[PDB]
Assembly symmetry: D2
Homo-oligomer: 262 residues x 4
Amino acid sequence: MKYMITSKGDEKSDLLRLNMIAGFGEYDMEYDDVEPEIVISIGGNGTFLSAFHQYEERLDEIAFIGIHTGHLGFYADWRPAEADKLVKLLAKGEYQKVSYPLLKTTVKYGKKEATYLALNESTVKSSGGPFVVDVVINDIHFERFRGDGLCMSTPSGTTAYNKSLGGALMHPSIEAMQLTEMASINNRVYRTIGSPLVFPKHHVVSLQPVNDKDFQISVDHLSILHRDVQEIRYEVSAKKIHFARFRSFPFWRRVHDSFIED
Amino acid sequence: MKYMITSKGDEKSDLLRLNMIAGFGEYDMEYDDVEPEIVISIGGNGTFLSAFHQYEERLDEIAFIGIHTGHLGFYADWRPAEADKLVKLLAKGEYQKVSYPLLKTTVKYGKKEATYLALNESTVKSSGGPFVVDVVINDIHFERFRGDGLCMSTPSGTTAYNKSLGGALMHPSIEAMQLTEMASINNRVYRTIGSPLVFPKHHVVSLQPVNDKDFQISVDHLSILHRDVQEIRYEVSAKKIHFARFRSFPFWRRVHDSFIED
Amino acid sequence: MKYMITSKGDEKSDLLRLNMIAGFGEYDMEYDDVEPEIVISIGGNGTFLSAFHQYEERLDEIAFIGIHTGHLGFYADWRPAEADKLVKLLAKGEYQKVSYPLLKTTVKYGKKEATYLALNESTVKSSGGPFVVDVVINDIHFERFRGDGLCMSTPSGTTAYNKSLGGALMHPSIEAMQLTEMASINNRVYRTIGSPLVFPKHHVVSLQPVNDKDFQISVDHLSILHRDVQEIRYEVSAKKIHFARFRSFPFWRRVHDSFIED
Amino acid sequence: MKYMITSKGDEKSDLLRLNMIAGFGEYDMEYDDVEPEIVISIGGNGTFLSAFHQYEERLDEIAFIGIHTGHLGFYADWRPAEADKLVKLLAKGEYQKVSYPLLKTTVKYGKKEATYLALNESTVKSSGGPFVVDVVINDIHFERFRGDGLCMSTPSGTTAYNKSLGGALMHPSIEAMQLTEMASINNRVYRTIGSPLVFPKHHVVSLQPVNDKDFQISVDHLSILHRDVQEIRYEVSAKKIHFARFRSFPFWRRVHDSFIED
Ligand SMILES: NC(=O)c1ccc[n+]([C@@H]2O[C@H](COP(=O)([O-])OP(=O)(O)OC[C@H]3O[C@@H](n4cnc5c(N)ncnc54)[C@H](O)[C@@H]3O)[C@@H](O)[C@H]2O)c1
Ligand SMILES: NC(=O)c1ccc[n+]([C@@H]2O[C@H](COP(=O)([O-])OP(=O)(O)OC[C@H]3O[C@@H](n4cnc5c(N)ncnc54)[C@H](O)[C@@H]3O)[C@@H](O)[C@H]2O)c1
Ligand SMILES: NC(=O)c1ccc[n+]([C@@H]2O[C@H](COP(=O)([O-])OP(=O)(O)OC[C@H]3O[C@@H](n4cnc5c(N)ncnc54)[C@H](O)[C@@H]3O)[C@@H](O)[C@H]2O)c1
Ligand SMILES: NC(=O)c1ccc[n+]([C@@H]2O[C@H](COP(=O)([O-])OP(=O)(O)OC[C@H]3O[C@@H](n4cnc5c(N)ncnc54)[C@H](O)[C@@H]3O)[C@@H](O)[C@H]2O)c1
C-alpha cells in the first residue's frame, strides 16, 4: 500500500521516520507522498495537524496514523518505542477505520468566498478593537455577541481550545459542532446566551459584522487577518477524517489519559 | 381523536380547560384520560412535566401539546389567548410530529432495580454527607468524583438545571445525554474532568459508591432518598417524547425567546 | 505555657499525641484543656476545624498549631515526622503570631437569634424544595436569588467550598468575606449577578425568605435544618483566629503546594 | 475653584459642556485645564477613562465627576438632565471626597522600565503566538501559565473585563488587585490555579517570559506591543483616584443598577 511519513524535524523524529521506511522496505509498501493511502505523522499534535492539512483535498482516500513524541497524543495512537510493531501491523493490513467529523468555515467578502476545513476548531476575534457580531442560526437572529471572540469546535476539537473556554467534551461519533464564548460582556443592556451551544449537522451558524468588518480568523494552527468580511459561516462538513486502528483505544480512555491520570 | 387536558389547578387554567372541552364538543374529539392520543397541558413547566410522567407508559401512542400560563414555555407552544385557534387546528388533524430524546436511569441495589425516565434530567447528591462516586463509562474507570453531585441531562433538559451548572445547550435532534458537575473538588490529590461531558446513544455511564451507599436521586421534579445503592446507570432511552406541531417554532428561537429577549 | 492536643483518634495520631506530651514533660509546659494558651491539632482539616470550634469562646487567648496526618494542610504547618522539632520550638516560646479573619452568621426567627462563627464558610440551601431568597446588602435590595444555594466564605475559606463554586482565592490579610452562587438560575425573567461578590468589614449581607422559611444552613462541618427563619445575616467577625508560627510559610506557597505541585 | 470639562465630542456632549461653562460663569469658578481641581467628564465610560489618564500626574489635586451620555455609568454619577443641579452643587462646594485604589504596572526590558497606572485593569497576551509566562508572587514561583492571557484588575475594574473572565466583584474600599485567567490550558502535564486570585497592597505579582519575550499589554483603553520584555510587575499603586460626591450612591447599588435592573 502507498504511504508517507511526516516528521516534526528534530533528530528523534527524523531517525524514527528513517527506521520505519527501512522496515517498510521489507514489505509491500511503496513510499508516495503525492497519492498516499496511509499518512503517518511523527511529532506533536501540531505535526499531526500539519499532516491533516497537507492532505485535506484527499481525505476520502487516506487513513491517518500518529506517533507522538510529545506528552500527549490526542490524534496519536503510538509511542516511539512501538514503531516496529506498527510497521508490521500496517504492512499486514491489520486495521479497521474510524471517522471523526470536521468543521467547514466559509468567509464571504464584498467574493471570492474562502472555505476552510478544521480538525480542531475555527475562532474569530477582532483585529483591534471591540469585537461585536450578530449571531444568526438558520437565518434567525439569535444574539448580538460582544466580548473577546468566539470558538467553533469539532467533537475531537472539544478537548482543546473549546475545553479552555468552558465547552463540553463531545464523543466524536456525534456529528456536531460546538460554539463557545470568549469573555462575553453581560450587563443590563448587552446580553449573550452565556453557555456553549451544540449544533447538529445541517445547522448553519452565521456571524455578521456590526461595525467593523476586519477579523482575525483562526483555523486550527492557521491564523489570518481577514479584511472586508461580510459573513463568517460555520457548518459541519460533509468531509470526514479517517484513522487506521489496530487496537481498541476508546475516546473516553484517551480523555482519561490526557486529563486525569497517565 | 381521543384526548385529555391536565390543568395546573388554579382558576385561570381550569376555566381554559373547560372552554377547550366545550369547543372540542363541536368536533370529533372524545375525552379519554385512560388512552388519549393527544395530551394537552395547561399550566407551568411543572404541569407539563406532570403530564409527561402521568403517561410515560404510553409515550409511543401520545403527542403532547402545552399551553403555558407562566412566563416561559420550553415545552408549551401556546399562550392562553391562542386556545381557540389550537382547538380548531387539533380537531382538523392539522399537525406534524416532532420527537425529543429521553434519559433512562437505572438504580441497582443489594435488587429489584428501579428504572426511571427523565424529560429534563436526573441528578445525584449525597444523603449527608460527602459525595464521592466512581464514574465508569462503558466499563472503563474514568474518574473518582468528589463534590456536591452530578447532573445527567437530556438535550431538551439542557436549558434547565444543566444550564445553571455550566452545561452546553444541545439541539434535541441530537440523540445524546450530558453530564455536568456540581461543585467539583479539584486539588493536587483529587481530580475531576472539570468540563461537561456529552455522550451518544448506547454509551453507558455508571456511578459506583465509594463509601457510602445512600444517595438523593432526582428525576425531573421527583426526588427520592435511595438506600443501599450498588450502581446508578445512565443511558439514552430507546423511548422518545412526541409533540404535535402546528407551526414552525425552532428550538433556537425558543432559546432566544427564553434567555435573550421576549 | 498551658497547652492541649486534640487527636483525630486513629492509632497514628494518638501515638504522636502521647509522644508530644512525653516530650513536653521535659519542659514548662502544663497540659490544660480547659484554659490552654496553645491548641495543637493532630489529624486532617476536619480535626483542625473541630479544635477551632471547641475553643471558639477563647480565641483571643489561644494560638493554634496543626500537624496534618492527611495530604493536605491548609491549617497545618507540620508533618508527623517534624513533631520533635515542634516540641522544642513551642517549649522555647520561639514563635510569632498570625491572625486570619472569621465570618459571623446570625440566624433570626419569628427570636432567640442564633449566632455562629465560621473559619471556612457558611452556606444556605433549601430544605426541599426550590431555594429563593432576597439578597439585601446594607439595607439595599440587591437581587432575588434563585438556584441551589449560596456560600459565604472567609479569606482562608476561599481555597475550599468557595473555590469549587468559582470563587476567588483571597489572601487572609484582607478583612473580607466572599459570596458565591450555587447553580444560579438565569433567564429572561430571573436574574442574579452571576459573579462572586467580595465584601469588606462592616458590610452586612442579609438573606430574606421569599416563600418558604425553612433552610439547611452549614457552618464549616456543622449542618443544621433551621425552621421559621426570618433572616440570615452575614458579616466579618470582630473575632480572629490566631496561629503560632515558627518559620515563614506564605499563604501563596501554601496554595501552590495544595493545588499546583507538592 | 479651578475646573475643566472634557466632552465625548458629539453634539449632545459639546452643548451640555457649553451650558455648564455658561452656568459656571455665574459663580467662582475658573476654567483651567492645566491645573484643574475638578475634572468633569461628559460622555461614555471611555470618555471618563480618557479624562483620568489626561490628568494621572495630578491625581492628588483633582476630584473627578462624570456625566454619562451612554447607558451606563460606572464612574458617572450624573445624567445629562441633572447638569444644572450639578453646576449649583459644585459651585457651592457641597461635596465629600471618595477614593478608589489603582493598579501600578511596570514593564522591564533588556531598561528603561515603563510604568503605567490603570483605573480598570492591565492585561497581557502574546504577540503571536502561544502565551506562556511564569507567575511569581513575592519572589516565589507560583505557576507556569499557559493560555490566552492574564488580566489584573483594580476593585472598580472588577465590573469590567475582570467580570467577563469570571472574576469576583470587589468593593473599592478594599485595597487590592485581582488576577484572572483567559482560557487557561489545564491537562495532566500543564496546570494553573484555575481560580481568580486577590492580592492585598504590597504584594507583587511578576510575569516572566518563558520563550518568547514579545507581549501585547493593555492598560485600560491603551494597548501596546512591547518587545524584548524581561518582566511585567503588578502591584497596588500608592496613588488613588478621588471622586467628588454630592449624594450617597453606594457601589452595590451601582452594581445592581448596571447588571440587575435599571
Ligand atoms: N487557550 C487555549 O486553550 C489555546 C489557545 C490557542 C490555541 N489552542 C489550541 O492549540 C491548537 C494548535 O495551536 P498551535 O499550533 O498554535 O500551538 P499552541 O501552542 O497554541 O497549542 C499546542 C497545544 O495544544 C494541544 N492540542 C492540540 N490539539 C489538541 C486537541 N485536539 N485536544 C487537546 N489538546 C490539543 C497540544 O498538545 C499542545 O499542548 C489549536 O487547534 C487550539 O485548539 C489553545
Ligand atoms: N439550580 C437549578 O437550575 C435548579 C434546581 C433544581 C431544579 N431545577 C430544574 O427545575 C425543574 C423542575 O423543578 P421543580 O419542579 O422542583 O420546580 P423548581 O422550582 O425547582 O424549578 C422550576 C423552574 O424551572 C423551569 N424549567 C422547567 N423545565 C425547564 C426546561 N427544560 N428548561 C428551562 N427551564 C425549565 C421552570 O420554568 C421554572 O422556572 C427540574 O427538571 C430542573 O431542571 C433547577
Ligand atoms: N463541593 C465542595 O467543594 C464541598 C462540599 C461540602 C463541604 N466542603 C468543604 O469541606 C469542609 C469541611 O467539610 P466536612 O467536614 O463535611 O468534610 P468534607 O468531606 O465534606 O470535606 C473535607 C475536605 O475538604 C478539605 N478542606 C477543609 N478545609 C479546607 C480549606 N480551608 N481549604 C481547602 N480545602 C479544605 C479537606 O482537606 C478535605 O479534603 C467545609 O468547610 C467546606 O469548605 C466542600
Ligand atoms: N471581553 C471584555 O469584557 C472586554 C474586552 C476588552 C475591553 N474590555 C473593557 O473595556 C474597557 C475599555 O475598553 P475600550 O475603551 O477599548 O472600549 P470597549 O468597546 O472595548 O469597551 C467599552 C465597554 O466597557 C464598559 N466599561 C468601561 N469601564 C467599565 C467598568 N469599569 N465596569 C463595567 N464596564 C465598563 C463600557 O460601558 C462599554 O460598554 C477596558 O478597561 C476593559 O475593562 C472588556
